[PDB]
Amino acid sequence: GRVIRGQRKGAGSVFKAHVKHRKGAAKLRHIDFAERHGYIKGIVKDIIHDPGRGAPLAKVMFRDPYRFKKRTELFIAAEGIHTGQFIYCGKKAQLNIGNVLPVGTMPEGTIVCCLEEKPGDRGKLARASGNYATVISHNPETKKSRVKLPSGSKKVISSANRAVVGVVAGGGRIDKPILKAGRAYHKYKAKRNCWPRVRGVAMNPVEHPFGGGNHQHIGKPSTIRRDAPAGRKVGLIAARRTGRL
RNA sequence: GGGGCGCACCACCGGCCCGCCUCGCGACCCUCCGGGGGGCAGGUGGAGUUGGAGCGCGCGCGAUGGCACCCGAAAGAUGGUGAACUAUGCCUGGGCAGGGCGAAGCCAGGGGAAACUCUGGUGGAGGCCCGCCGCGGUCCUGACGUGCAAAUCGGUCGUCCGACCUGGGCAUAGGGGCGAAAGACUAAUCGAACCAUCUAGUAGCUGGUUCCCUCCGAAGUUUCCCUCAGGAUAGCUGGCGCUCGCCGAUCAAGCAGUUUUAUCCGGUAAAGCCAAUGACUAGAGGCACCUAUUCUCAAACUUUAAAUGGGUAAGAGGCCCGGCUCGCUGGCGCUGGAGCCGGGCGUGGAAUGCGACGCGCCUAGUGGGCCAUUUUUGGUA
RNA sequence: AGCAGUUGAACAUGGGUGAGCCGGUCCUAAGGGACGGGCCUACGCCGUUCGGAGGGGAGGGCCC
RNA sequence: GACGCAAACGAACCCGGAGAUGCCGGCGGGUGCCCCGGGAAAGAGUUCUCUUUUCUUUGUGAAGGGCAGGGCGCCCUGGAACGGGUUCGCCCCGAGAGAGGGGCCCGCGCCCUGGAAAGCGCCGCGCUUCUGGCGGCGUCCGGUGAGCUCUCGUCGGCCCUUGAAAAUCCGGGGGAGAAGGUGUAAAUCUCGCGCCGGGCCGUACCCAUAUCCGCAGCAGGUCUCCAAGGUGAACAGCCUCUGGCGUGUUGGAACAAGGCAGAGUAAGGGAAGUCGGCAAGUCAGAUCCGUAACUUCGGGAUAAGGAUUGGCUCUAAGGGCU
RNA sequence: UAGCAGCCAGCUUAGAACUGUCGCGGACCAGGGGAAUCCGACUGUUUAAUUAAAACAAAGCAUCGCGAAGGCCCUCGGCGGGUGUUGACGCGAUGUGAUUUCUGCCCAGUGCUCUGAAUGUCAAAGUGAAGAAAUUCAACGAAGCGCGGGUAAACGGCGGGAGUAACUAUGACUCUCUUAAGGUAGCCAAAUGCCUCGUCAUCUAAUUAGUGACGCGCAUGAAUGGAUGAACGAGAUUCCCACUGUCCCUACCUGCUAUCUAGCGAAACCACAGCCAAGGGAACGGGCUUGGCAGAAUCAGCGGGGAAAGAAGACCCUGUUGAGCUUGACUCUAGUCUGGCCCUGUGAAGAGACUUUCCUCACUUACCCGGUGAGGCGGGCUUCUGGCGUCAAGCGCCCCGCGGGGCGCGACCCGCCCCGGGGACAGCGUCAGGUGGGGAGUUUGACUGGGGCGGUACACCUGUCAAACGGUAACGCAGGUGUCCUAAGGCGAGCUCAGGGGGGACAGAAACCUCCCGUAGAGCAGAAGGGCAAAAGCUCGCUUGAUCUUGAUUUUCAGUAUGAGUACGGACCGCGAAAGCGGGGCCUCACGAUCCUUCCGGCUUUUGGGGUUUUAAGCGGGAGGUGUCAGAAAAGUUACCACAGGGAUAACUGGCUUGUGGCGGCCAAGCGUUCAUAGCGACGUCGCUUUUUGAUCCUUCGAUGUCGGCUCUUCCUAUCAUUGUGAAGCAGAAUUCACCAAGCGUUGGAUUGUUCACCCACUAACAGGGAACGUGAGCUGGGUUUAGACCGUCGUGAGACAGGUUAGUUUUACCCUACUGAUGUGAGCCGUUGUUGCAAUAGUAAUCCCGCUCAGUACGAGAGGAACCGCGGGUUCAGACAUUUGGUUCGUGCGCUUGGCUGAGGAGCCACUGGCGCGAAGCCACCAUCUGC
Ligand SMILES: [Mg+2]
Ligand SMILES: [Mg+2]
Ligand SMILES: [Mg+2]
Ligand SMILES: [Mg+2]
Ligand SMILES: [Mg+2]
Ligand SMILES: [Mg+2]
Ligand SMILES: [Mg+2]
Ligand SMILES: [Mg+2]
Ligand SMILES: [Mg+2]
Ligand SMILES: [Mg+2]
Ligand SMILES: [Mg+2]
Ligand SMILES: [Mg+2]
Ligand SMILES: [Mg+2]
Ligand SMILES: [Mg+2]
Ligand SMILES: [Mg+2]
Ligand SMILES: [Mg+2]
Ligand SMILES: [Mg+2]
Ligand SMILES: [Mg+2]
Ligand SMILES: [Mg+2]
Ligand SMILES: [Mg+2]
Ligand SMILES: [Mg+2]
Ligand SMILES: [Mg+2]
Ligand SMILES: [Mg+2]
Ligand SMILES: [Mg+2]
Ligand SMILES: [Mg+2]
Ligand SMILES: [Mg+2]
Ligand SMILES: [Mg+2]
Ligand SMILES: [Mg+2]
Ligand SMILES: [Mg+2]
Ligand SMILES: [Mg+2]
Ligand SMILES: [Mg+2]
Ligand SMILES: [Mg+2]
Ligand SMILES: [Mg+2]
Ligand SMILES: [Mg+2]
Ligand SMILES: [Mg+2]
Ligand SMILES: [Mg+2]
Ligand SMILES: [Mg+2]
Ligand SMILES: [Mg+2]
Ligand SMILES: [Mg+2]
Ligand SMILES: [Mg+2]
Ligand SMILES: [Mg+2]
Ligand SMILES: [Mg+2]
Ligand SMILES: [Mg+2]
Ligand SMILES: [Mg+2]
Ligand SMILES: [Mg+2]
Ligand SMILES: [Mg+2]
Ligand SMILES: [Mg+2]
Ligand SMILES: [Mg+2]
Ligand SMILES: [Mg+2]
Ligand SMILES: [Mg+2]
Ligand SMILES: [Mg+2]
Ligand SMILES: [Mg+2]
Ligand SMILES: [Mg+2]
Ligand SMILES: [Mg+2]
Ligand SMILES: [Mg+2]
Ligand SMILES: [Mg+2]
Ligand SMILES: [Mg+2]
Ligand SMILES: [Mg+2]
Ligand SMILES: [Mg+2]
Ligand SMILES: [Mg+2]
Ligand SMILES: [Mg+2]
Ligand SMILES: [Mg+2]
Ligand SMILES: [Mg+2]
Ligand SMILES: [Mg+2]
Ligand SMILES: [Mg+2]
Ligand SMILES: [Mg+2]
Ligand SMILES: [Mg+2]
Ligand SMILES: [Mg+2]
Ligand SMILES: [Mg+2]
Ligand SMILES: [Mg+2]
Ligand SMILES: [Mg+2]
Ligand SMILES: [Mg+2]
Ligand SMILES: [Mg+2]
Ligand SMILES: [Mg+2]
Ligand SMILES: [Mg+2]
Ligand SMILES: [Mg+2]
Ligand SMILES: [Mg+2]
Ligand SMILES: [Mg+2]
Ligand SMILES: [Mg+2]
Ligand SMILES: [Mg+2]
Ligand SMILES: [Mg+2]
Ligand SMILES: [Mg+2]
Ligand SMILES: [Mg+2]
Ligand SMILES: [Mg+2]
Ligand SMILES: [Mg+2]
Ligand SMILES: [Mg+2]
Ligand SMILES: [Mg+2]
Ligand SMILES: [Mg+2]
Ligand SMILES: [Mg+2]
Ligand SMILES: [Mg+2]
Ligand SMILES: [Mg+2]
Ligand SMILES: [Mg+2]
């Protein structure tokens, strides 16, 4: 047979991202002496819509401490901020919405967003619209903390990872039901070439391990092992259980 | 008319060499420690030996390896070239009459005790409707069907503000691409493109295989084979000879799809079942059986038993006589037996026919058969 | 030039395209593709704003 | 005061603007085209009868100066409820309406320089390869429109769609520096004008029922711009003017059969034809009435089912300006 | 002041009068409608060149993986690349397919997944012991497998049999079997129901259709989604209204062709060619045989034939030919998981032995990741606002000409890595084990009354077939075998069996004792045949001839091997007093090459430059086995299919055959009230026919187009009707049987694709067939019979269905005959030319019914009820014809009229015939009329 549609997505020919009209990479300010021993003042200039995601981005303009220049940072717009307000990033920053203070200096039960996995990566966890991570507990002995990622998994990260307080804007976006296939067409036309998903049973055995047969049955257990080769690993990969639940 | 040496060659019997087995176990001069021999004889295996025949070259033919008598596959592999068509994505541009229903919002007038309602107008929403260009291609299964056209033409028809149509520039390249998924599309080529090469790929399979005359002349059957459209093998065929007889039974002869004479073999036709095994009808006698009878049968039953047919014997390789040899045999140097040697005896001791279809070598084709008289199996035929 | 022709996109002999202000040239879009580095036995390939001691213009008379 | 004056020094560095933003809808300003009124001028057409008739032609470039017109969450005064202003729709106001007076932007419209000398229209004379030249007159006065396009604005609508980069150019912040000491100097965003230069390549023609592709002068295929009068809702169909053409690789004479097509027509019956109402036949625009079962209350729906429609002569209603 | 005057400007709406032939969206433009069923929600998309659909997509719903050292995926490769300018409201992988309403039971099987070294199996490396060593042995022992748990919106699955309620019936209720659960809610003869044209109702004069119901449903059923559904559809289906040449039943007109002509001018095709009947033949000739017969050269048609052209059949079989694809095929592989070694160093703690192994925690410098313009690391001064922040003001000190310059503090000092996060773990290199249709290569026996399924007739044995030597075939017949036996082998001795009769306590038809008869009629391991009585059977006691060896030889045979046998020679033995017998079974069957492994044997060989010892090799003989049995290591599918071929071989016709089907006789038990034969014919039996279906496989696979209908012609008779007759259980009428006889006619419809059926009416009757199951270059494609798709059942799957359902290119004649018409042709010319005729021969045509009268008569008890002659019409058919009626009308004849055009009137034109009304002439219709012996 030939290669399945899933194998062709790794080549990156027509399945690359559509990043022409995107406004940049949303990431926190790189950690420097100002964010380690104090705080830096920044002004929110504009809240723009990034084509491809459901969460707005804020263009916060800080002041460079070593040269006469004003840096522009493209943050994740936490729900509640507005243009013209001041955002303070650093250790000594107060516990307000929008500020970027390390998780080690936050009380237990804080709602953060754009959390950092490791110190310096400029914000990875809890970055989609309406999502957040809660700080569960601290540990001054091992300099570690425990946060609750939006997937429900409790991850143990360092106490120096910075995060934006407050939930991400654009919450409740998945509540409005898409009514037309055209709204789903324009939804993915800005993300990537992945929308029309042809079922494996609707294909021939050459293109998919589920195709073929005078009926449209699967014919084999859809639950597939994890060590299955690329080309066979379709359906339910390493399914611990199935059913309605 | 008699005798003899006998070529080549054939049949048979011996000698010797090598392997192996068995019996002799060892006295004896080859031993210098170690050792080597000890006619060993009797069977047996060998592509041996007992007075070489090979080598070289040339020619003919046959079976092989090779492109291999010529033309032909569907495929496989290596290396390249294509997204001017088409599929999807990206960048940047262009384009889509005229009408219809008419949503939120708003204004006004009425009803209310509040909750809130009713009428008109406004507004111009929509993968909304009729519909032109566009873009598609339903039906007539129309036209055309060596056409205008290697897919077109006419009427009709789908859609036409959205998942729309479209140009250019870019991206993905062959077991790869791409696919709102038809195994579709990827330059008229796609259930794996095109170009060149390996490649004159292989074919037990179709087709063809070129001058004349003379002579001989088949096989579709046996055995083995992942064989049953093919091979191997035997048979049938041809060629080259060769050993003789040629002289006729001057000669030995021998042979025969034939008879005669003589002697054996068989269990089919017929016959039998009142004889056995098995099947079977009917009375009668004696106290369901029992006896003597009776009707009807056998391919896997038979007492008996043909016709046709099969084998063998019809002479010198015989017949007869004498002597000798033996470890075999044993009352019995002959007790058998067999071998060896010598001598005596043609009226070649049935008919007919014929040179021996004698001794070898090489060998093509064939290995699908079909029909008839009689015999006969399966089948209604 | 599927009949013809005194005709032609045929044949023969000559002639014809003039730019500071039309466009190319210039810019980067998708994208292609060097450099550093890595990789490949190799021809070469991967990768593209990241990565090398990657700065050869500007100013004050020798500084930056 | 918005901001205006011909100019009106200024580095490093910084900040910002323009380049540079979608689709759709409504409205308004301006051109082009069309139309109407001159009982307008110059030629032509018609005249059998009528026709002060019918047809054609009546002009201004870029750039600059001025002025209409359009736009503005631009300024000052002032202060709002009996709330007012205002659009087709909206929208606006104590974070300051209405009103009064100003500022700026766009002006592709009009006047002027250009510029009538030229261009068209008409008339006359000279001339027949210098001839293939010289003269005369005219180029006018208004109107609007649910008209059609283009364009500039403006207010909205839609998105789980937010609808490009860079060269290049400009403004501001910044005040490092430079200029002369009593008439000039530094510096000038020409600030009025003058001087010099602008190389290289493409440029003809066809652009499709005969210059491209499909073996061809192939009923196929191939990206765009301009686009008139009448009927009509229409860029539909039919007819006409500008422009183009000879009927699409041939003429002539016949009008048999049989075909293709005209979606030709038909007595009485009306699907009895046929696998099957295949085929084509009925219906069709618009106005006024009237519209069920069912339903997700959106629809069904142009449901179904009726009436009216020409021509001509009138009447009534719907405007603007002084 | 309930506003007026003047002037200007268009374009619409409403009402009314009048008027033309009731014509007016007048041309043009331009929805037929209604009641329901099936499927898909809708818009969209799709097989460029046969399938536009119910298929794909879709929103909605649900499951699955993954927190970045990650999920998914790419690359030969860089810890390179895609999702990712991403971060669970995200990305990746699947099923379902809107909304409404629901989504039941089963975790045994397969698959996924979790648990765990707490017990089996378990590689490389390492560790231990023996040994000169190679080597052998033992312990240890990862993932995976095994054990256990979970999971079905994972693949999937979801049963049988009796009794029983006051007639009958049903079986609530019980009984039994049985699982892993035994189909729940629903729905249905459904696109799913073989039987089947189910049954009832409805729809029609009539319905295999449609719809509503019924449900033990071959084989419905719940996200392999069930039920329903407004709107929507170039989807499938039924009925109704309107409409119409679809039809009854065809006719007429027009344009472009065909036709003729000037010019121009091909191609497919072609063995030679072209009249038929029959015969034979390779079983359907054009040519051959026997007959019919046969006259130049051509035009327009035509579709009977040339088993016409197009194309080495696509179906079928064969090939030791392929390809696509799928798995539980065979053999491998990328990837992935796992362990040892490696870069890999350092410090410490604990527990088993005496420098150490296991595990854990730490060190940073190897290694790895992240951040930045490597901007403040380690050790002793900004939170009230959508301002501003740029190379230092100041102080100290120094150097030059009031003008310049430089330095330090401001801006603390020291340092070893830029700062963080891991860290000798990730990772890399290399072996090892597991997983691995993701991918690669290949295989997937043969025989065979086609192949497949079945069978083994594939290696063997008995009787028969087999025709009296031997041999002799078929998917001939009746059978048997892949074993059994330390005795059932060998030998010696003794004994006599099967059965029957007479007897004998319990004891009987069967126990045991005994006498008599007993040719074997018993037994001999098995199938059968043969053989056997002091045996070969039975019993008993001694035994290992069931051993070791060379050759000869029989049988299958090629006269090869193996297997199975026979007779001897040489050893060593058994039994017997002995002669003798015995190297397996009473005989015919019971079995296996090369290579390799293994064991036994040597009075032995090599291990090579010698010697010694291990090891290995070799010679001789067994065993391990190839049952496809002279011996490959091997699962499917293909309807997406390809190639080489095959009429060696199936599906059509034809041919032979006629079981079967159909049809007709013979005999006469009996039926017929009585009477065998008016009409029938049981038990038997003899034939015909090729309109049934088989059997066969001769023709055809470098192709004979294939089911039905439509259309049209002709023949046959085994006669339904009509004509002429015979017979009766013929009174009449009606009907039945039979004869001469195919001249003539044999219908319109509902349902079904149907031939075949069934019903509705009509009728003199509505007979049965043939002609390549007549007839596709005649048509129609409904059916079947490619590719799309749906369901049911089956398969793990790809896929299958002789089951259902929907959409699916029907090509060419101009050649030669045949036929239909149209010119012309004997040419030999005193013949040329014309008129009027004759006639061979060929075709041939009429058919049937009704009404009146006979007649209410014959006849009959009645009820009922004819016929001939004559008269008047009609059905079907045939040949004509246009006076009349009707159709057509581009005499474009006349009138009218829509839009536009010529300035208007008048007169006209344009819109491929603008439209409408009427319409001459022609042509035309059982739609008018006339004739038919
Ligand atoms: Mg499919
Ligand atoms: Mg499948
Ligand atoms: Mg499905
Ligand atoms: Mg299944
Ligand atoms: Mg191969
Ligand atoms: Mg656009
Ligand atoms: Mg509608
Ligand atoms: Mg259209
Ligand atoms: Mg298409
Ligand atoms: Mg078409
Ligand atoms: Mg057609
Ligand atoms: Mg034709
Ligand atoms: Mg394009
Ligand atoms: Mg690749
Ligand atoms: Mg598509
Ligand atoms: Mg398919
Ligand atoms: Mg496609
Ligand atoms: Mg002799
Ligand atoms: Mg053979
Ligand atoms: Mg041979
Ligand atoms: Mg010519
Ligand atoms: Mg010329
Ligand atoms: Mg030329
Ligand atoms: Mg732009
Ligand atoms: Mg733009
Ligand atoms: Mg606008
Ligand atoms: Mg104001
Ligand atoms: Mg400035
Ligand atoms: Mg030009
Ligand atoms: Mg032309
Ligand atoms: Mg005609
Ligand atoms: Mg016609
Ligand atoms: Mg009619
Ligand atoms: Mg009919
Ligand atoms: Mg009908
Ligand atoms: Mg139709
Ligand atoms: Mg309706
Ligand atoms: Mg239903
Ligand atoms: Mg239906
Ligand atoms: Mg649909
Ligand atoms: Mg198609
Ligand atoms: Mg699922
Ligand atoms: Mg579906
Ligand atoms: Mg379920
Ligand atoms: Mg399970
Ligand atoms: Mg030693
Ligand atoms: Mg049920
Ligand atoms: Mg019907
Ligand atoms: Mg029903
Ligand atoms: Mg079921
Ligand atoms: Mg089921
Ligand atoms: Mg189902
Ligand atoms: Mg519609
Ligand atoms: Mg449709
Ligand atoms: Mg429909
Ligand atoms: Mg549609
Ligand atoms: Mg012939
Ligand atoms: Mg043919
Ligand atoms: Mg062939
Ligand atoms: Mg073979
Ligand atoms: Mg293939
Ligand atoms: Mg495979
Ligand atoms: Mg293969
Ligand atoms: Mg076979
Ligand atoms: Mg055989
Ligand atoms: Mg057997
Ligand atoms: Mg014989
Ligand atoms: Mg012996
Ligand atoms: Mg017969
Ligand atoms: Mg019969
Ligand atoms: Mg009787
Ligand atoms: Mg009789
Ligand atoms: Mg009978
Ligand atoms: Mg029949
Ligand atoms: Mg045959
Ligand atoms: Mg007769
Ligand atoms: Mg009779
Ligand atoms: Mg027949
Ligand atoms: Mg036929
Ligand atoms: Mg045909
Ligand atoms: Mg037919
Ligand atoms: Mg025919
Ligand atoms: Mg069909
Ligand atoms: Mg059918
Ligand atoms: Mg099909
Ligand atoms: Mg079927
Ligand atoms: Mg009477
Ligand atoms: Mg008439
Ligand atoms: Mg008119
Ligand atoms: Mg026209
Ligand atoms: Mg017309
Ligand atoms: Mg008329």
Swiss-Prot record:
It comes from the Eukaryota. GO terms for molecular function: RNA binding; rRNA binding; structural constituent of ribosome. Residues 206-229 are annotated as: Disordered. Keywords: Cytoplasm, Ribonucleoprotein, Ribosomal protein, RNA-binding, rRNA-binding. One of its GO terms (biological process) is cytoplasmic translation. Disulfide bonds: none annotated. The keyword Hydrolase does not apply. The keyword Ubl conjugation does not apply. Pfam families: Ribosomal_L2, Ribosomal_L2_C. GO terms for cellular component: cytosolic large ribosomal subunit. Belongs to the universal ribosomal protein uL2 family. Component of the large ribosomal subunit. The ribosome is a large ribonucleoprotein complex responsible for the synthesis of proteins in the cell. Component of the large ribosomal subunit. This is Large ribosomal subunit protein uL2.
